[PDB]
Symmetry: T
Subunit: 141 residues, 12 copies
Amino acid sequence: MVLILNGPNLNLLGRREPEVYGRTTLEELEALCEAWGAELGLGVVFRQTNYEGQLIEWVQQAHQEGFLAIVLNPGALTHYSYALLDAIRAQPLPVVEVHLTNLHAREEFRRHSVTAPACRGIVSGFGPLSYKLALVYLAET
Amino acid sequence: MVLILNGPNLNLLGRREPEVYGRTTLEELEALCEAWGAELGLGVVFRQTNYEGQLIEWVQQAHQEGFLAIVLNPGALTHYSYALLDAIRAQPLPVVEVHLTNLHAREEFRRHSVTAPACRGIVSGFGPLSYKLALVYLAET
Amino acid sequence: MVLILNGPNLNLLGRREPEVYGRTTLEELEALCEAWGAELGLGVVFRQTNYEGQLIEWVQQAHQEGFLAIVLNPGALTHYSYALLDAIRAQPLPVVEVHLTNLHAREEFRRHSVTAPACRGIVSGFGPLSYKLALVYLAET
Amino acid sequence: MVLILNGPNLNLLGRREPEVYGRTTLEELEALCEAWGAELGLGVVFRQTNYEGQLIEWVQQAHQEGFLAIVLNPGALTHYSYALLDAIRAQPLPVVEVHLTNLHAREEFRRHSVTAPACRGIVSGFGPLSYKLALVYLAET
Amino acid sequence: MVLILNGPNLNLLGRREPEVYGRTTLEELEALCEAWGAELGLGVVFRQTNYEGQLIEWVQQAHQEGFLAIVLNPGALTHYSYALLDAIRAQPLPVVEVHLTNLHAREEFRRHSVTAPACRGIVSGFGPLSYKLALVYLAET
Amino acid sequence: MVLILNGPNLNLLGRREPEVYGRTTLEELEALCEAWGAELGLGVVFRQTNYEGQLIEWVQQAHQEGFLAIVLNPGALTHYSYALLDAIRAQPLPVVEVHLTNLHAREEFRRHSVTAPACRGIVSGFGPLSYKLALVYLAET
Amino acid sequence: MVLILNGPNLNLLGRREPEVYGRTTLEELEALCEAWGAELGLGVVFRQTNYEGQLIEWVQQAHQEGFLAIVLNPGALTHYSYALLDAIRAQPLPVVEVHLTNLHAREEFRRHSVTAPACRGIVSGFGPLSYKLALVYLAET
Amino acid sequence: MVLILNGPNLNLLGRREPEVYGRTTLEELEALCEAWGAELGLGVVFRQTNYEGQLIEWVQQAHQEGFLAIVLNPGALTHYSYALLDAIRAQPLPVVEVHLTNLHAREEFRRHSVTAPACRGIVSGFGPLSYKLALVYLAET
Amino acid sequence: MVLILNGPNLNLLGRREPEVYGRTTLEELEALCEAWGAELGLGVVFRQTNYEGQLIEWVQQAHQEGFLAIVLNPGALTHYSYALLDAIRAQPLPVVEVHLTNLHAREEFRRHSVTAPACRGIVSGFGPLSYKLALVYLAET
Amino acid sequence: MVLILNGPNLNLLGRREPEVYGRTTLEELEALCEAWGAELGLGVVFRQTNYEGQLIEWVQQAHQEGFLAIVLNPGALTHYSYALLDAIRAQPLPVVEVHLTNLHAREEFRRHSVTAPACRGIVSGFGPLSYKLALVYLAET
Amino acid sequence: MVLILNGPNLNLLGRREPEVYGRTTLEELEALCEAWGAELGLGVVFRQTNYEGQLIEWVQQAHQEGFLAIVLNPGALTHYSYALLDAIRAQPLPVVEVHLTNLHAREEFRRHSVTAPACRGIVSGFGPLSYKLALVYLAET
Amino acid sequence: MVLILNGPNLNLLGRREPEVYGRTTLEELEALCEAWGAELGLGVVFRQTNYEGQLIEWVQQAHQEGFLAIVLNPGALTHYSYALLDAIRAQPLPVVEVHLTNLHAREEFRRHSVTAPACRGIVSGFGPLSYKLALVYLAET
């Protein structure tokens, strides 16, 4: 069973931009994940928060709750939350970093990920399909 | 109506310094902002927190509560919260960034504002009057 | 009375950009400042020059000519004239720095102000209204 | 039909390192791409070269050969070949960047990709499976 | 009486590494601090949180609650929370900064502390005994 | 009609160096420019100042006076005058930046032009012939 | 006789953009240089490659084949090919660097040229006329 | 037995400052260190030099003289003497680095300890009591 | 005969600070320099300006008016006017750079002098005596 | 048996300067290394190319061809070619980097070697004798 | 009386260079400095040393020896010896820094002085005469 | 004859590491150099000191003692001793820089040598044979 954790501002998906983030809402996104996982023999729980400390605790406590991997979009936290980096290093599950947009075709600061060094890997730029790619890697491993 | 939001540590105005911040308290600051809005035909609501998450949520939900504009003093978050920047970008209201002190006459790191790129404008160094001036701009607009 | 000093290129306001600057000309900004000033118990005189030396001389001399404060738009000199910085520090009047545009949403070089540290505060982003705001601060003080 | 292109040194897959790269060889990687591609509806062709010019050439010419998208692992060239960047930009297919290793857990210079800004997206860190996730995104789109 | 405050991830001590952190748990740590305190004429209260906002709150409030000093290990927030810095500068109590590990023999970003400048001093690298040394300084002062 | 403008120190062509500049004077430079304009059918006025403010007024006022294009050598102002950059962006004439020497074979500070981003093009290293190539571009366009 | 050498990607002139490069193709560009050279009494040979080592072999060899000078557009290799720099420094012919676009109004990396310190001069911005200006310098010289 | 070692300028404690360094002298310092050692079962010797080479020799040699640990205050050499660093790494005793003042509250260059990465730990800012703290750690180990 | 040239803001000597600049006026400074000249056999003339242009012209012309040397205090222009630098380089007289205050004990930007590399030397920190020391050098040479 | 590889422009040895490279040819340099090899019972082969991708294949393939060791002068590629780095790390032979000039006594960019971290050692500044020194090392080893 | 102290390599004055340093030896420099002092009523001792430690002790102990001022040429230690900087801060005498050569006209690393901030001032460029300049300042003060 | 000079810590060769420096002592290294030289027609003497001062004096005096070249291992002084650099520049003998380890494969501060630019050349990475390589170059020269 896999936990999908989303950081700040991902609750406003749908309203926030046209041609930067796309049309799909946070709800439409979980329902996509539920299905991608389901076809593929993976159960999924999906969560979002705007609080660093709540994101950290979800990552700390995923192994205790019986999940066996995390798919994690930290939102803008990916560029500065060393506390989230220490949370992922301090816990045993594999973590896959996911982003809707290509961080390398926007502002300079988005190009640097403080969480990515502790993750299994990173997928980004594929809209909603980034999440799906992570689920296909998780299913095989 | 306009929402005035304040970041960490501004709850302690009055006792943090006397040559850095002034003597006016956060309570007196709101009362000033209420009277300024009111002379001028602007309903105000004034809020403060020490939590990045809570600041984010208040900027995010502000338009859904009926507010027409936000006046925003992120406190030290101004210099590192890309999550707060994204919050302001993800919502439709004009945001005016305000600071009591002149950011350019203190430590180097205060000189950089990560939220300011997404605001209508910035006002700083005037003490409580930076809030005043934000309200005059907003009434006119 | 207050002295309103404008740096290079601000003589070309109106014809220079539609969205960056606006359509309001230098002639109309001065008429707007005279009326903002007036209702309101502040006399203003309004000057523009393309010469660093002329701007410096006007800041150095304002106190001897009776003025009680300076509102100052250095134009692009704000990002390199340390001569102007030292001029404002060499004289006793409070100086308010003002910019039509939001300096933090344009080229990186525009984000750094060398005059700003010696100013009482800074206002930027609000078009002609940045000037109005500096005046409301000054009238109260 | 999708062109999978690989840069310098990936011909030595299987012999460079244990921990860093893993055991699968360039030949086993094309057959794995062959099968991941067929199983799911996609004809693939897989090329590798040690020459920057050759890579630039294969990406320029791909759409004229009737390919519909490029999967691209530039090898170390990802960190400095702006001529490859220009090549991907000068031509109309979507390019997905792919790497075997997690770039952000190795040397600092690995962390920056000059090709990434012109790609649809990037997937990295999943061993041979990074190529598979590239192919599932491409199949859907 | 002394407040001992801990930031993010210290709740996971015991499980996160062996020869980075060791095996002593947060729980065992507090009982160590109680005991070291007790020999030595000092009452301790020990607290831990994964939220910047709550660490900030407790440092702001420690003096109202009657503490005479803070011993503070911010966890990874030490590298980036300019809000915590400000919280420490905003309240009267001496703060001693403590870390289990030597920050200078680990990754580059762990070497810069944005809190240390407002602290009385820093002790780091002696594992749990870093806490003990802070308490020995506080008992003598 | 085209305006050829020269900034500080170019009045001293003749006696500054042998190897850096060569032996042609400003006077002989303008006579060369007059001949090169004539043969090819372009009226030229040639000017020089040591004053930043004067160069700026000249670039501001050129369209109004009836010139169609500016050939511009700002001298050392090239590496720092952002006010000259804005002068050039504030006016509709195309501007061609020119230099007698190859700015990239001298001091490091000479390599960066702050005026060049706003110019149609730049030509440097060809001695007096830089001005001529600028004239041959503009006669054609 | 002069050699005009063109680096990578310049073979796709015509389909890369409209506003960045314009419509004229590599074949139309060589035609133009043929004619411009003929109207000038200069013979020209025109070449293009995607390979660094091939560009290098042409500049090295040129003086052996009887050429008097080289007009050189390295494409993106102008921002990192120190081997090209060394090629131009190891041979006696004068080299003029040429670019279609104004490097200084594009991406930051485009603004540094590692070939330019070794060239007689640089002309950039003027589209296919950059090459015309280079030939006019050279005919005089 | 433990060897306390002290680098340049520390011989002048007492006259050098009152609130930067405080008033206690070198002599008074060794006396406090002997008392702190001697209730507590540690013999200590205490040494100071203005010469890098002499400090280097003392660290090299301490294990030969029978010492079990080094307490080390390199004075300014902490910010630049890699030879000291390599001395601490060339020998097997553990080294505690100690500083009377808080290195993070002073000049920029004082924040980088080149010796620290090789030490068990560091204690700074507690005046003379920094030495005490290093001793209690060492008594325990 | 020697020419002593003074840049911006030095005309306000007297009132600008007490412990930064001290109490002597520009007037009194030129008298002191008049006398220091004569005890020493040197005619002096003393000029101040606020315009970079005018300092530039004065330096360029000094030799034509009959002067044999220049003592120069460029004011804040020392940190940025590469045009001044070029002026000193384009003329044959020896130039001594002088500053009243110690540029190394003030803001970080004051420590870089762009004019110094072309001066015979620099004297800085000695108040009005900086000028005296320059004259003593020049009377010897 | 040892393989000695030379990168771009080392074929022009004899014509590039009298004081930078001196007068000995590539021809004379391979004769020279065949003799230093033969004197000391080392068999040698000597190759040179202008193409990054050829150097890379030669270093990748040397063990396959039965060489025991490489000596490698990358030419200008030592400063930017991470692809050559990875070729060296991908194959099991020891590589000694060699250069004719002292890199540290030329341009800044020449001081950094991106190859040398994966080489046994580096020798540079001894002209042709640099290759010889690398042979006497490989002999012993 | 004043103490003139000289750091490494200045014992070799006279055979290091012709156009950098001069031909005057260390013994001739002393004889000069003695005379310059005496004629003016100011006694002098002059010393030189190659050891940092020895220079430091000479600065530390100068007030104790009855001297009233120090004239200091630290030699290359000026660009890195913070221990010397601290030595100058630790003792009550005024210190004038002096350099034979113009530091701003050599290699970049020479342009930063770590001792200058603690000195009354700095004089450099004037050969032997920089010492003369320092003595005339000291005699008047 | 040739003088071989060793800096700090190199006396402890043998017990410092295995994998960084190996097992051979400074005693055994000097035996090794004695043989290498005598075998090869070269007198050698071999010195080591922990003091920057003493290394400088040995390099300064060497040409006076009749030696005719220096082999020089600065130890960690190679990364910061500009005083050593100037010693090597002030004396006429060719100096060769030698290190046991490859500086480019260790911590980042070791990659930069401030001495290397004044040296004939450098050899590093070959343990004890680095010295041998040095000797053979000098034998020829």
